Amino acid sequence: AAAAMTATRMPSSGSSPSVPSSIIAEEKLLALLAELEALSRQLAALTQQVSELREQQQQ
């Protein structure tokens, strides 16, 4: 009634960026698709000359 009455008396907000580091970029990209063919070409050339041992030993 008196004394104190003179003054006065959720779910999901879904953030995303959190506490990780900063990020950067560059545009000098992508030789790498050539080596996948270099590697599998030269791999064949190994077997090709293993065959050239065998095809001369068989003579």
């Binding site: 008196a2 004394a3 009455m5 003179t6």
Partner: protein
Amino acid sequence: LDMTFEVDPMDEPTLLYLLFEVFDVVRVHQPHRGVIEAVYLRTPFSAGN
């Protein structure tokens, strides 16, 4: 006129100061050397009759 006020209780004796705003005007007439006749009207709340 009836009026009521609600106030924070003060724990000591205090006073409501209430001003009823009215005109409180005087007109001063000086008809002869050394004579001052001043006429007062406060309205409403006039003092007289």
